[PDB]
Design an enzyme around this catalytic site. Structure first.
Site, short mmCIF file in Angstrom:
data_model
loop_
_atom_site.label_atom_id
_atom_site.label_comp_id
_atom_site.label_asym_id
_atom_site.label_seq_id
_atom_site.Cartn_x
_atom_site.Cartn_y
_atom_site.Cartn_z
N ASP A 24 35.26 9.25 30.41
CA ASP A 24 36.37 9.86 30.11
C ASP A 24 36.77 10.96 31.22
O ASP A 24 36.23 12.05 31.18
CB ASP A 24 35.99 10.51 28.80
N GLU A 116 28.79 20.60 26.06
CA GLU A 116 30.04 19.76 25.43
C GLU A 116 29.70 19.59 24.02
O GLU A 116 29.02 18.41 23.86
CB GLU A 116 30.13 18.54 26.43
N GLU A 125 29.61 16.15 13.96
CA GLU A 125 28.28 16.23 14.59
C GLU A 125 27.81 17.56 14.66
O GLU A 125 26.33 17.92 14.84
CB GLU A 125 28.15 15.52 15.84
N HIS A 273 38.43 9.97 24.28
CA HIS A 273 37.66 9.53 23.39
C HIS A 273 37.63 10.27 21.88
O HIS A 273 36.94 9.81 21.23
CB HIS A 273 36.41 8.91 23.86
N1 LIG Z 1 20.16 20.97 18.72
C1 LIG Z 1 20.09 20.29 20.17
N2 LIG Z 1 19.19 20.59 21.34
C2 LIG Z 1 19.45 19.96 22.19
N3 LIG Z 1 20.14 18.91 22.68
C3 LIG Z 1 21.23 18.66 21.43
C4 LIG Z 1 21.13 19.21 20.27
N4 LIG Z 1 22.01 18.77 19.53
C5 LIG Z 1 22.46 17.73 20.07
N5 LIG Z 1 22.08 17.72 21.57
C6 LIG Z 1 22.48 16.78 22.55
O1 LIG Z 1 23.82 17.17 22.61
C7 LIG Z 1 24.51 15.80 22.76
C8 LIG Z 1 25.42 15.69 21.95
S1 LIG Z 1 26.86 16.57 22.44
C9 LIG Z 1 28.19 15.25 22.66
C10 LIG Z 1 29.62 15.76 21.89
N6 LIG Z 1 30.55 14.82 22.35
C11 LIG Z 1 30.60 13.80 21.35
C12 LIG Z 1 31.89 13.04 21.44
C13 LIG Z 1 32.69 12.58 20.55
C14 LIG Z 1 33.64 11.72 20.79
C15 LIG Z 1 34.31 11.82 21.86
C16 LIG Z 1 33.74 12.12 22.93
BR1 LIG Z 1 34.17 11.94 24.84
C17 LIG Z 1 32.56 12.73 22.72
C18 LIG Z 1 23.41 14.69 22.63
O2 LIG Z 1 22.60 14.53 24.17
C19 LIG Z 1 22.51 15.25 21.98
O3 LIG Z 1 21.13 14.64 22.16
#
Ligand SMILES: Nc1ncnc2c1ncn2[C@@H]1O[C@H](CSCCNCc2cccc(Br)c2)[C@@H](O)[C@H]1O
Ligand SMILES: Nc1ncnc2c1ncn2[C@@H]1O[C@H](CSCCNCc2cccc(Br)c2)[C@@H](O)[C@H]1O
Ligand SMILES: Nc1ncnc2c1ncn2[C@@H]1O[C@H](CSCCNCc2cccc(Br)c2)[C@@H](O)[C@H]1O
Ligand SMILES: Nc1ncnc2c1ncn2[C@@H]1O[C@H](CSCCNCc2cccc(Br)c2)[C@@H](O)[C@H]1O
Lengths: 336, 336, 336, 336
Positions: A24, A116, A125, A273
Site C-alpha cells: 500500500d 501504524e 483491532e 487497503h
Molecule cells: N500489544 C502489541 N504489542 C506488540 N505488537 C503488537 C501489539 N498489538 C499489535 N501488534 C502488532 O502490530 C501489528 C498490528 S498493527 C497494523 C494495523 N494496520 C492494519 C490494517 C488494516 C487495514 C488496512 C491496512 Br493498509 C492496515 C501486528 O504486527 C501486530 O502483531
C-alpha cells in the site's frame, strides 16, 4: 478475549500480510515521507516502534538518523524483523524486542514513538490502545508519529446497497426449500446482515452533507479514553433524499518539528487497503436539503479486539428516527 | 491454541450467511436429499443422529423420509435457529435439537443411522470427520452412516500460470532496496510461506498428467484415532511429458443405503461445488516423461488448529528427482 | 373473445411467424412425409386445408396428386398463399379461400381434411375446435390428417424451477424499496408466477413416473368435446422425491391407408417449437418409489382462445394433496 | 382494432411482473425519485395527479416529498394493487387511487402538478403521451408537469452485421424449392416485413456517423392533437464516410422543477435502460462521404393500435441517393 488475541497475532505472523500492507503505497510512502522530512525529530534520537511487524518503520527511523530504535512485536513476525536488522547491518542501532508492548521491558525512555496502529474506522483491532500504552516509555518532550487521528462521519444515500441486504436475506423467505419452510429465520438473517459494517469505497456523490470530524490527540489521550467513544453529529443536509446510513473514513497527522504530513483514507483520496466503512440504518430517513440530521455514534470496545457500534439518528424537522447496532469484528468486505 | 481455534470455528459457524452459502450449493443439498429420500427405508420409523446439523436441513430430509426420532446435535449458536425451524415446520415431535459438542452431549437412545456433512477442503479440513467417527458411540450394531465412505483422489498436474502467480507473489521479498530496505534475506521464508498454502479453486482436467490415485476411508469401520495420522502412498503412471507443478486433490463420498448407493462428487469432471478442488504446489516443479512413475507419500498429521499439517514427498523414479513440501491447511489461497 | 381473436389473427398475418413454423423441420418434414407416403389418400382426391397459412400443406397435398385442394385462411396470410399458388402454377388445383372455416363457403365436400391445429399442450389457441368444425365438409369415408392426438402427463421434480418462483416474487418482500414497503403484494406476485405454465424443455430424468395418455380421436370427436377436458391420472412412482408439478407434451398420428406417421413433441424426441409445458404445484408432494399419485387435470376453454388449467393431485398412501390453477394464455417462456 | 388493442394493452399492464421489471430499472426509478425529492417544494402541500400510476411508486415519491393530496389514476387492474400498497404504507389520507382512464375519470379538484411515466420505445410508442397531455384538463394555470420536456435524438448509423442479420432472415423466402415449393414470389414482401421492424437494443456509439438531430416536445405547451402527426425534419452533417444502414433513435426527458432540472436519458452514451435504443433500417443502405449532408423527414402518424406508422425519407444531397422506408412500431425486433 484471549481466543481472539491469539488468532489476531497468528494472522499477523504471515509475511503475506506484511507484504500486502507494505505494498500500500499510501501507507508506506506517507510514513517514510513523514519520518524523513522531519529528520530533526529522529537524528540521534531514541525511538520506540510499536508493533513493528517486519520493521519497515524502524528502518525509516534509522534512515532519518536515529541513534537507537526499539522495535517491539508480539507476533512471530518479530523473528523476521531480526533477520532484516542483521541483513541490513543495523543491529547496533535497531533492537527487536519480541512480545507485547504492555509486557516487554524497555531499558530506556524514548524520544519519539512511531507506529501504524490504524484499523478499519481507525479504531478496529484496538491497537491504538497499545499505542497509547507505549507512552509509559515516552519522555516529557516526547512526540508521537502519528500525532493525531481524525475520524470523519457523513450521511450517505445508496438505495442499491440497502436493497442488497433484503435481497440476500430473502433466501430464507421460502416456504419449501427442498420441502423445508425457511421463512421463520428471515428476520434474523436481515438483522445479521445489517449488523455488518460494509467495507468498500464509493463515489463521493453519495455523501449528503459535509462530514463531522472527531479527533483523538495521541499525545494527550489515555488508553481508557478509547474504551468508550461518543461522537455526536449534527449534519446540515446539502442534498434531498433518503439517508441509508453513515460513512466513515479517517486521517492521521504526523506533526513534526519541520512540517506536518497527513495520511488520509478519505474517498476523495486514492484508495488504500483501509477503504471506507459504511453502517446502514435499519430504515432510511428522508431529509430535505437544508434539514438537520442529528444524533450520536457510540463505539464501545468489545472482547474481540473491535467495537460494538450504536448509531442513533433523527431528522430534526420531522422527528423521523433510526437506531442501529453493528459489530465491527464481522464486517462485510464488499469491494470486488 | 486448540481452545481458541475451536472458539473461532464455532463462532464462524454461528452465522446464518454461512448456512445460506452452504445450502445454496445445489449439488451438496440436492445430493444429500436424494441419498436420504431414495433410501427412505433406511429412515422410515428409525432413530437418526444428525452430527453438526447447523440449520437442521439434513434432519428435515430424514423427517421427510419418515424418521421417527432425529437427534440433531449442534455446538454453535446456530442450534437455536434450528429449533426455530423445527417449531415453524411443526416437527417438534420428531426432531430434537441438542446443543453442544457430540463428544460431550448425552443422547437418550442408540440410533439406527448417523447422518452428517463433515467434509472440508480435501475432505479432511476442520477435522470434523473425527467428531463424525466419535458419534459411532451412539450407533446401534446394525447401524449405518451417511455418508458411508470417502474417497480422496490425488493426481499430478501441470499449471505454469499458477506456479508463476505464487512465485511472483513470493518475489516481493527478493527486493534489495524496497524503499531503501533490503528484504532479500527473507525471500526463502516468503517462498516457503507461499508454497505452504493449498490453492482452492477449479481447473480444466487437461492439466492432469496421470490417472488419479484413490485413498478410501470407510466411516463405518474407521476409528476416531485413525484420523490423527493419515498416510497416502501413491505411484502415478505418467501419461504426458512435462513439468509436474504439484498434486491436485478432490473427494467423493458414498451414501451406501439399502435401496441405493448415492455419490456426492467434487471431482473436476463434475459440476463445481463450494468445495472446489485443492492443489498443493511444489517449490521446484519435477520434470517427468510419459511412461515414468511418480511415486511418494502424502502424510496428514492432525494439529491443534482443527486441521492437518501436510507433508508431500514425490519423486520421478527414473531420475531420482525428488520434491518434499509442507502445506498448512489453515492458510488456504482461495483463487476463486 | 373478439379482442383476443383479432390479435390472434394479426399475429398470424406475419411472414416471420410462417417462416418460424416452416423452419421447424419436425413439423414440416413430418407433415410432408405423412402426406407423401399416404399418396393413395390424396391422389385425385378433394382436400380441405384448415388454416393453411402460407399454403405449405396444400402444396404437399398437390405433390401427392390431389385433384382439388381448398385452403382456408382467416388472417391476411391468405393473400400471400394466393401469390404462392399462382407462382407455383397450381391455380387450377389449389383454391385459396380467405376467412374463417366456420363462415366461408365450400362448393364441395372433401375427401380428406389436413391441418396443423396444435398449440402448446396440443390445445392452446383452441384451433382444434375449428379443425373439428371443418368436419361439416367431410364425406362419410373422409379422413383427417392428423387423425389422433395424444396428450401425455407425467409428474416431475425440479427444485430449482420451483425455487425460481419465490426468488422472483421476493422482489416485493422489501420494506423500503426507495422508501416504499412493497411486502403486501408478495403473495399476489407468488400467485401470479404460479399461474403461468412454463414452456421449455428438460431432461427426461426429472420425470418420476411413466406418463398417462389422454387421446382425442379427431374422426369421432365433436367440437364441444374440447370445451371441457377432464384427464384423470394415477401415476405409479418410479422414483422417490418431491413432486413439484406435472409435465405435458403431445403426439399426433396421421393414420393413412398405407401407413401411420407420428409427429411427437416428447422430451425423448428432438426439440420442436412446441417445447414442453410444465404446471407447478403451489406446494410439492413427497412420494416414495412405489406410491401412487392420483388426481385430475381439468382444462376449461376460456374466452382468450386458451384454457384454464385446474390440477388436483394427492399421494394416496399419505393423503398429502395439492391444488393449483393456471392460465395457459399467459405462459412463461423459460427456454433460453 | 382500437378497442382490442386497448384491451390487450391494459391486460398486459395488469401483471405484477411488468411492474417489477419496470421498477427494477434503477435509472428510471432512481431518476424519478431524484427529480421529485430534489424538487420537493414543487410537491410540499400540493395537489398531484399521477397519470397511469401502475403500482403507485411515483405517488409514493410525491407523498415522500410532502404532497397533501395525490390522485393516482390507473386503468388496468393494477389499480387494486396500488390501493393495497396505499393502505399497507398508511397513506390513505394522501393517496387516492382512481381506477379507469384519465380521459374518463372525474377528479374532485384541480392539481398543482401532473406526474407520469408515459414514455415508450422511441418515446412515442403506446401513445400514452396523448393521455398525458389530456390530463392537462385538470392542471391549474400555474401548474407543472413531470416530465416537463422530451427530446427525441436521431442519428445515422452504420451496422453491417445488423443489416446482414435482417437480410438473411428475409432470404428464407428467396428459396425456389423449400420442400419442393417456390417461395421466391414472396421474398419482396418478406424483406419489407423484416425492415418495417424497429430494432430495439443497444449499441456502441462508434456506429453513429453524425451528431444527433434533436426534436423537442414541450409537454407544458403541447396539445393532445399535436401528437396525431409528428414531422421531424433532419439534416445531418456526415462525420465519417461509409454506408448508412439507417437511423438510430433515443430520447431524454427533463423534469424542470423550481429547485432543479433533472434529466432522464436513454442515450447510448448513458447507462442502459429497459428502453434501450431503437434503430430503423433501410432496405438499401445509402453510401455517404464525410462532409456530405444527409437530409430528410421522419413522419409519425398515429394509428388505432396505440402506436405510430413511421415513414422515414432520407437522401444524400450530394448524389440524390434516396431511401424511403416504412416502420410498424407495433412489431419490434427485440435484439436484446
Ligand atoms: N500489544 C502489541 N504489542 C506488540 N505488537 C503488537 C501489539 N498489538 C499489535 N501488534 C502488532 O502490530 C501489528 C498490528 S498493527 C497494523 C494495523 N494496520 C492494519 C490494517 C488494516 C487495514 C488496512 C491496512 Br493498509 C492496515 C501486528 O504486527 C501486530 O502483531
Ligand atoms: N464437535 C461438534 N459437535 C457438534 N457439532 C459440530 C461439532 N463440530 C462441528 N460441528 C458443526 O458441524 C458443522 C461443521 S461441518 C460442515 C463441513 N462442511 C464445510 C464446507 C467446506 C467447504 C464447502 C462446503 Br459446501 C462446506 C458446523 O455447524 C459446526 O458448528
Ligand atoms: N377459424 C379459422 N379459420 C381459418 N383459419 C384459421 C382459423 N383459426 C386459425 N386459423 C389459422 O390457422 C393458423 C393457426 S394454426 C398454427 C398452430 N401451430 C401453432 C404453434 C405453436 C407452437 C409451436 C409451433 Br411449431 C406451432 C393461422 O394461420 C391462423 O390464421
Ligand atoms: N388512458 C389511461 N388512463 C390511465 N392509465 C393509463 C392510461 N393509459 C395507460 N395507462 C397506464 O399507464 C401505464 C402505461 S405508461 C408506462 C410507459 N413505460 C413503458 C416502458 C417501455 C419500455 C421500457 C420501460 Br422501463 C417502460 C400502465 O399502468 C398503463 O396501464
Amino acid at each position: 478475549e484471549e481466543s481472539s488475541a491469539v488468532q489476531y497475532f497468528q494472522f499477523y505472523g504471515y509475511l503475506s500480510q506484511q507484504q500486502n500492507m507494505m505494498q500500500d503505497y499510501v501507507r508506506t510512502g506517507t510514513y517514510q515521507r513523514a519520518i524523513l522530512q522531519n529528520h530533526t525529530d529522529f537524528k540521534d534520537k531514541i525511538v520506540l516502534d510499536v508493533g513493528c511487524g517486519s520493521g519497515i518503520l524502524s528502518f525509516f527511523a534509522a534512515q532519518a538518523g536515529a541513534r537507537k530504535i526499539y522495535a517491539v512485536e508480539a507476533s512471530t513476525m518479530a523473528q523476521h524483523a531480526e533477520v532484516l536488522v542483521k541483513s541490513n547491518n543495523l543491529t547496533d542501532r535497531i533492537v527487536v524486542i519480541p512480545g507485547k508492548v504492555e509486557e516487554v521491558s524497555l531499558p530506556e525512555q524514548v524520544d519519539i514513538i512511531i507506529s501504524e496502529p490504524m484499523g478499519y474506522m481507525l479504531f478496529n483491532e484496538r491497537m491504538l490502545e497499545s499505542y497509547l500504552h507505549a507512552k509509559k516509555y515516552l519522555k516529557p518532550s516526547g512526540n508521537m508519529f502519528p500525532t493525531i487521528g481524525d475520524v470523519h462521519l457523513a450521511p450517505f444515500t445508496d438505495e442499491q446497497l440497502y436493497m442488497e441486504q433484503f435481497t440476500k436475506a430473502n433466501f430464507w423467505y421460502q416456504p419449501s426449500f427442498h420441502g423445508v419452510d425457511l421463512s421463520a429465520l428471515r428476520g434474523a438473517a436481515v438483522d445479521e446482515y445489517f449488523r455488518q459494517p460494509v467495507v468498500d469505497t464509493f463515489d463521493i456523490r453519495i455523501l449528503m452533507a459535509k462530514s463531522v470530524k472527531y479527533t483523538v490527540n495521541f499525545l494527550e489521550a489515555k488508553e481508557g479514553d478509547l474504551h468508550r467513544i461518543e461522537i455526536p453529529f449534527k449534519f446540515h443536509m446539502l442534498h434531498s433524499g433518503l439517508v441509508h446510513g453513515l460513512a466513515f473514513w479517517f486521517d492521521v497527522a504526523f506533526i513534526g518539528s519541520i512540517m506536518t504530513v497527513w495520511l488520509s483514507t478519505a474517498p476523495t483520496e486514492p484508495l488504500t487497503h483501509w477503504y471506507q466503512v459504511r453502517c446502514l440504518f435499519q430504515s432510511p430517513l428522508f431529509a430535505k436539503a437544508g434539514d438537520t440530521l442529528s444524533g450520536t455514534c457510540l463505539l464501545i470496545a468489545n472482547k474481540r479486539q473491535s467495537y460494538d457500534i450504536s448509531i442513533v439518528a433523527q431528522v430534526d424537522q420531522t422527528g423521523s428516527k433510526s437506531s442501529n447496532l453493528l459489530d465491527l469484528k464481522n464486517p462485510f468486505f464488499r469491494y470486488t
